[PDB]
Structures are given as structure tokens and as C-alpha cells.
């Protein structure tokens, strides 16, 4: 028949100085189930390398080691991990425990990396910890336990997956005489229950506890020989301790990884909040700058929407410097607008003049801008009437005091819901009857904020201003038929009619396009100086995750020796980085929101901030990608660690 | 007389569960110089607490401990540090060494904090390491040494400041039988030389190496008693080992802190380059943005530097057409300039007209801008003549073909060094003789470009263009009067002289002023989106330093135990952060430079980058301040650690 542990011709060469050295010189050994073995030797003998190979933490590399008939010489890390989970459990001199978890958690870890019900492993965990006398200390964390207590914890952990072969590296080397007697007694009782126990030690008095003492020096076994410890008379073995034993599952273990990362974040908070804080600052700056640019383009377009579509406007210079030069040198007259009206390219034309007067309705008064306009004006500027009607050509000609108001004026005087149409307000000293209401241009506030009122320009000029000239003339170019050449033919036409070239011309579509270009581009470059430099300046996640790997290299080694797959470590650290970046992106979004509603307070009427709902989705996605990226290299470096070198590193 | 170590009724309490517990009950001890003492007890007895107090790492809270007649009960941390450096040296179970330093360095550390010459301490370090058999291993790092070898290193370290009282925790607890005999024999040999040695242990077989065995349980000494070890005959001495005992020094401690921070940086490289890298990106982005803005303001001012200082320009005209229906409406005539000349506010006036023609000198062809101007023109635009003279009022009147050239045209045709004055080139079909050379408006060597040439405006209008009108008229404002009132009187004046308001005017000083305002504030905002978001988003230095304090807590404890002052730890980590920020702030400056010389290629004439030499100084200063700010909190957290808790944390 075949023994459990079958060692044939193990040669382990570790290279040193462009040459190889044999730490194991061709050892043959056979250990059957249930046997109590102490491998004893001095430092450099090869005892601990031999144990590493026995524990499937290392390969022969020349020879054969068969665990229950399975050769490990060619096996790959996850296969050796399988053998660890099924057959082996470990105990170390300094009794490595996870400072984050508790006793029950440390005990659970091996069950976690195997397939286990989270309820069931709580049952076995608390059960084993109770058998070993820690029942009251179940919830204690390693910093809260003594040396002996921690070593008993790691015993329970080794027994979680059944402890078929328990490998103890100098288990009493760290702790005192009493807890040493207890650890040794617990092991001997476990062997009495049938556990194969192999303890490696440099102390002969320690090796006395075994029934079989193998002695190793300079990579060869010099002695192996039966032994009966004398304390078997001391301990009659009264109180019995017997405790022997790609679709689907990656969901389950990935969930486990989520709680591993989550509780590890909860353990270390301050560092989570700082690394996360960089990303909060980053996403906040990104969304703040992008949304500020979007809202400022939107604002300055709706603020300049006072022009309209396909509208060429015609101005004058000053012509002042005296009040005689007013009636002299102001040459733009409504006759010019009438002339423009008969042109083939003009769909609509209006003159315009304005004055500020006190608008009174009943007891309420206010200050309003009164705009003398043609009845065509609402067509050219593109205003749509909420309720009423415009004037007529008849009413423009007859100097009607019919008046049109905008939504803001309705809000001012008629807040009662009383229909303003038909109501007679007074503008200055001139009464007016409201024939219509207009919904204005702007999206948000803007600069208006101002009460607009429209009367026929004839009535404003004659009844109010007392002037023969027009402030400016707006035209809607029909068909968009040579929209630029219309402006040119307009200046040619009025320059003929005037004595000289008296008139400035302003193209609305070109002004809008220029504003959109400049705002869009500068929002792009400023937002790049935010995004690229900041979020890319959030590499610190990578750095802190690298230092988190170097920190936990022992934790990683213990995880692997307890049966962690490389995939399991990688998923743990990727899920940690991903989760930190995701949550810190959510807080970056919220900081950007509240910060933006703060920036709406500031005096800029040109500055507004508009949050694109597809820049928020892009924010979450990009933050999570920062997690998956930086973010990656440490999560892979951890899973690629050598569990031997990882376990012994300090 | 009084013995070295005098303990009288020391009671050491710790709070447990909202109540106090006595770990040390009233203990009396007297240890004279030269005694070999083993304090032996089990875990919880109070033995290691008693040692901590003996080592001046902790205070009794009840009672007295006098080191050579000096009560430590009320002493402050730097005072206890003094006593450590003067009297004590330490040895720990796991033989704590600094993985960064070598054997010689670890041995030096106590001498380092004791104010010793690096030459002298190198001698004593190598001497002690040779005495203990490490002479060949002198340069090895702890990772390169065996357990016994490392413990021998820490022995030499304890002997550095003289090892009057050597306090050993379990010295053999980590290491095997042979190296145990070696370490323990070395101790007995040191006591033979007169070293007071106190070794605390949980193992009686270890305690028997001492001549005096004190035994302690539940905070009291149950036994104290002489002992003669049997190994005194087994150890015969063939090699007696006897090695017993203003403005200045703060600069020394800063030098040491600089050296060790530097070597620690050299130890961990990837961490350093990543931590820096954020600040390299940050400083690069700030200096790039500010220098881009300064250079773009520099260009957009030099692009509008085609105007003068205190220079009002007068334009007109848009549409094409006939000689009748267009040229009749061109009202700018040199007569307008003559009228302006007699005004009190006008220092100089020139009209201006331009045409592009092919300039030929000998075999060279080129294309030049030909500017009809008044002889006053160089006065108003502020051009200075490199060599020759301007025209005369007679030559302007007489349609002279005398011509003035700028530096660029000289560079083109006369690159032979041939004096251009007197030479006859031809402009188009019109020959001209050069009477003068002008140094242009350029700020920088990329602004100027095109070849300017100036003839009297009369000659250009009549001989070339065939037009009666002037493209525009430039006016320099005398008295340095109000340029706005100048515009007002100019527009009134030419508006009266013309039929109507025919003329547009540009104020040069106001345009320049506006460009400077908007560019400056704009770049301040964008550079704030760099700095505020980036360098402040470079908190990660603080985080890495903070976890670097965590990882080094044992290193910090050992340093304090060898005599480190809190100030010394503070200087170490604060100087580390400072150097991390400064180095890489310089690399951020260099990255910004190279990026700027990249942007000088790929960018147009509006984008240029000009690096202010007072923005680089500000870069170094600000980076170092980021060090002194963010690095501080960790550097303080390290210096405030309890050496007891720091040593036993893991």
C-alpha cells in the first residue's frame, strides 16, 4: 500500500552567486497517517525547506513528493493550493494571524477559500475555538490575545479544513513554558485523535514531544528513531480532544473578496479617506469645470439670445458731443426700415428704440424698459406670445398705445392670476392697454431680471422720447439666402440712403457661432487641465496599494498557505482599489454638486454651472476605471508572491 | 555608596476595565556595577515591564528608580533618552536591526544620536564588529545575515555607547543552540570585563547562565539568589573580550537626518519615484500654465503692438462698389490728418495706406508690405531708426520715392552686410532709394515676420493705388492728455468735417489694458485649476509618509531605545518629506521646461510660453513648503510614539 506522505530523492537546489547549492541532498522519507513526527536540525540543515515542500509550498525540485499518491513536482500554484486546502494546515513559530480579523475570522479564512457555507463556517469556527478554550475570547482580535491564545487560535484555524497533516514550524519558539506545555499537549491530543502532525524544530527538548524523531543536518537525515515522551505519564489523557475531519463559484468567492476588502477598509480608515480624498478632489474638479463651462456657454448664449436667428442688426455711431448734433447727425430713421422691408432678402424688419420709465398698475409701481418696435418685431427676434396678440400695421401707423408685456412684467404686477390682457397700466405719463404677453429669450436669470414692455415705435418716439431717429434696426434674413451678403447689401443700401457710411452691422449667427467655438474650446482645455492632471495625478491609489502589498506580504503568504488561490488575492486587491475609487468618485460627484450650488451664489451672471447627467455617469465609469487600472499592477504583484518568501519576510 | 541600579518600592499600574491593575507591586532591587543578573518569570509576571523601567523606557508611577543616583520617576522623554545613551544599551529577542542600513550603520546609530564624529564612529563600529567576528560581514545588511550574526550585530550596537548596563530581552529565544551558546558566551565575557548585564527570560535554563537569578511572579520577586553556572568550566577564556566604556550641534543633527533620509530614499526607490511623480506632474502643470499664459499675453500684446502708445486710430468703410457709389462715401482724406494736426491734444498724426507688392533688389525677389505714411508716422507709432532718417515734409509733398525699411527687410536682401542706405530697390514697378532703417515693434523673435517698407503716403496713393482716400489715420495724444477725451474731440471733429458719423476709432491704451486684464485674470483662474487641484491634490505625500510611520514604528522604537530624541525622529521624517517634494519639484520644473520647448513647436503665434525666473524660485519654495506642511503631521506622529508600545507592536 502507499503511505500518505511519500518522499523519494528530494533534491532542492537554491542558486547562490551564479552557482547552485543543495539545501536538500536527496532525502528519502515516508510518513504514514496518524504518525507524530519531529524533524529536528540546526539553522541551515534544510529542515524548514523540507517542511515547505511537505506543505506543498515548494517543489522538490528534483525528486518525488507524493501526497496520498499525488506527485507535486510538476504541480502549478492553484493545484498545490488545492492540496493545501484538502490535506494540510499550518502553524508557525510567530503564529501569524490577521490583525484585521478576529479569532473567529482567522479560523474562518481556510473555510472561506474553500467552498463553505458562511453559516456553517461560523458554526465550526466557534466550535473549534470553544474546544480550545477560547469560547469567551471568540470575538477578540489578535492584538487582544496573548501568545498562547493566538497560537491556539491558529491551531483552530489549521483544524478548520480538517488538519489531516498539521505542520508546525517551531510552534513553542515564541511562547513560554506554560503555554508551550499547552500547545504541545493540544497537538499530542490531536494526534491521539489521528491527526498526522509534523513539527520542525531546532530544539531537541521540543522534539522530545514526538513519537518519532527525525534528525537532519547539512541537507541529509542523519537519524530517525522512535521516542516515548516521559510526560505521557504526567498527562494520562483524561479530557478528550478529538476533532478530525467558468460560471458558478467565482460569484461566491468574488462576494467574499468584497467583504474582505470592505472590512479591511473599515480596519484602516484614515488612509482610505486620504487616498479616496484625492479622488474626491479630482472628480469634483472635473465635473465642476466641465459643468461650469457648459453652464457658462449656455448662459452667455441665452444672454446674447436678445438678438435672434438670422437677424442682422444695424447701429449708429455716437453722433453726440452736442444736442444739436443729435438732430443733425443721427441719420438712422424708420424710413430706412421701411426701405429695407421692400428688399427681396428681408423677411421681416423692425426699428427699435428704448427708454426706461416707471410702470404703475394700481398701487404697484416698478421700472421698465419700454421698447418702441414694429409689429413685425416679434417675428424677427423670434418671440412667441404666451397669450395675446401683437399690434397692427394700422396701430403702428396710428400711434396706438396698445402695449405688449413679457413674462417678467406679468410676474411683477399681475401675481394675483388676474389676466393682464385688457388691463390699462401707465408707462411714465402715458397710459397703455395690454394686448399680449411674451415668453422671453433667456433660459435662466441672465441679466433680465428686467421688465420688458413693447409699444409701437411711432408712439414711443413721438409720445416719449421726442426724437426723429431710431436707435437701431433689426432684420430677419429670409430663406437664409446669402446670410452674409444680406448684411453687405444692407450696408450698401443704407449707405446710399445716408449721406455717408453711417451704420454698423452685426451678424447674430456669426456672433453665436464664435461664442460657441471659444467657450467650447476653452472649456475643453481648462477641463483637460483639471481632468488629465488631477485624476491622472491620482496615481497615489497605485502607490498606496503597492505599499499595501509590501505591508501585507506576510498576510498574503498566510492566505496562500491557508489555501488562497492567486485569483483570490488579485480579486481582493482589485476590489479594494475599485471600491475606494468608486465611492470616492461618488463623493466627488456630491462635492461637485454642492460646490456648484455654492458657485451659483457668486456675483457672476455670465457664470453658471449646468450638470450634464451623462457627465455624472461618465464620472462613475471613469472613477471605477481608475480603480481597475492603477489599481491593477499591485493587485497582480500580490497574487504573484512566493508564499515561502512571503511567509518569511522581515 | 549607591549602586548603579537602585529600585525602591516601584509600583507600576496600568488601567484595565475602568480600574487599575498592578503589573508591578512594590519591588525593591539593588544591582551594583558588574553583576550578571537574570530576571526570570512567566508571561504576565511583570518581568518585561520591570525591564522597560530599568531601561528608562517607562516610569514607575509609584516608587523610585535611581540610575547612578538619578531618579527617573519624574524625567521627561529627552532626559530618559540621555540616560539611555549614557548608561544602557539594548538587545531584543528578535534582535531588531534596521533593514536599510548595514551592520556598520546599525552599530553606528547610537553613536549617531550621541553626537560622535562619523570617522570615529566608523572606527569604533568596524572595531566592535571585528571583535565579535563580523569583520568580513561588516558591509552586510540585516537581510544578508544569520540570526546569530544579527544578534552579534546588535551586541556591537549596544556596546557602541559603552554598554555600561546591557539589557537583554530573550536573547536566545529566536536563535538555535549553537548561536545561543555564542551569544550567551559573548555576554558572560562582557560581564567578565565589568559590563553590568541584565537578561530577562522566561526560561530557567537560560537564567542559569547568570551569576544572580531573580525570579518574579504576579508583580513581585519571589526569589533572589546567587548562582554558579556549570558552563563556567565548559567555557574557558582563551580570548578575553574586554570592551567597556550653541550654534553647532543642531546643524549636525540636520546633517545626519539628511544623510539617513537620503539613504532611506535610496533603499525604497519605486515608492520614492511614484510619490515624487505626482509632484513632478503638479509643478510641471502649474509652471506650464502660468508660463503659457504669460507668453500668450506677451504675443497678443505684440500682435496688437502694431499700434502705438497713446495712439488713437481712425478707420472707416466696408462694402465694395463703383467709383461713384463707394469712393464718394470714403471721407478720410489727408486733409483730415492736417486738420487733426492743429489740435492742442495732438502731438503727431500720420495717415496710412498699404499695398502688398513684389520687392526686388538685384537678383532677390520677395513680397513686402508698402505703407504710405506721413514723415511724422515713425514719431507716432514710436519707431526708432537704426541708421538713417525719415522723409521730409517736402519729400512727402513732392511724391518722393525715398523709402524707409525695417530690420526684417534688411535681413532679407542686405544680409551681405551691404549698407542699405542709398541703395535703389524696386517696389512693384516703382523704384525707391533707401534713406533709413527702422527697428520694429517685436517682443521676441517669433512675433515680427513680414517685411515692412514705408514710402510717403502721397507717393503710394498716387503712384500705386490710384485713390484719393486714406485707409486710416493714427494720432499720438500730446501732453499725455486724456486719451478718452482725445477720442471724443477727434470723433466730434472729423464727424463735423465729414458729412455724418463716418469713422470708427480704436484706443490703443484701453485695448492693451483690456487684453492684459482678461489674459491675466484668465490665466490666474486656469493656473488655479492647476495648482489648487493638483499640488493640493498631491496630499499623497502625507499619506505615504503616514503609512511610512506605521511601517517604521519598530524602527522608531529601536532608535528611541538607542537614545533617539523626539526631535531627531521629527527631523528624520520631516526632512524625508521635504526632500521628496523638493527633488521632483526641480524635476517638475525641468518637465515644464521640456514641455514648453515642445509647445513652442506645435503651437501657433497666439500661444507662446515664457518662463518667469521668479516663477521658478516660487516653484522650489512652494514645493518645499508642500513638504513642510503635508509631511509634518506624520513626522510628528512618529516622534510622539511610545518606545515601549512601538518596540512590541507587531
Author numbering:
A (entry chain B), B (entry chain A): 3 to 247, 260 to 664
Provide the authors' own sentences about this structure as they appear in the paper.
A non-critical polypeptide segment between position 248 and 259 at the exterior of the NBD was found to be disordered. Each monomer in the dimer has essentially an identical structure (~1.1-Å RMSD in Cα position), and has elongated TMs (TM1 and TM2) protruding about 25 Å at the periplasmic side of the phospholipid bilayer. The TMs are not swapped between the half-transporters and lack the helical extensions into intracellular domains as found in most type-I ABC exporters. Even though the MacB monomer has only one cytoplasmic loop, MacB preserves two CHs as observed in other ABC exporters. CH1 is present in the intracellular loop between TM2 and TM3, whereas CH2 is located in the carboxy terminus of MacB.
MacA-MacB-TolC contains similar components as the relatively well-characterized tripartite RND transporters AcrA-AcrB-TolC in E. coli and MexA-MexB-OprM in P. aeruginosa. Here, we present the crystal structure of MacB, and show that, by analogy to RND transporters, the MacB homodimer contains two large periplasmic domains (PLDs) that enable the interactions with the other components in this tripartite efflux pump.
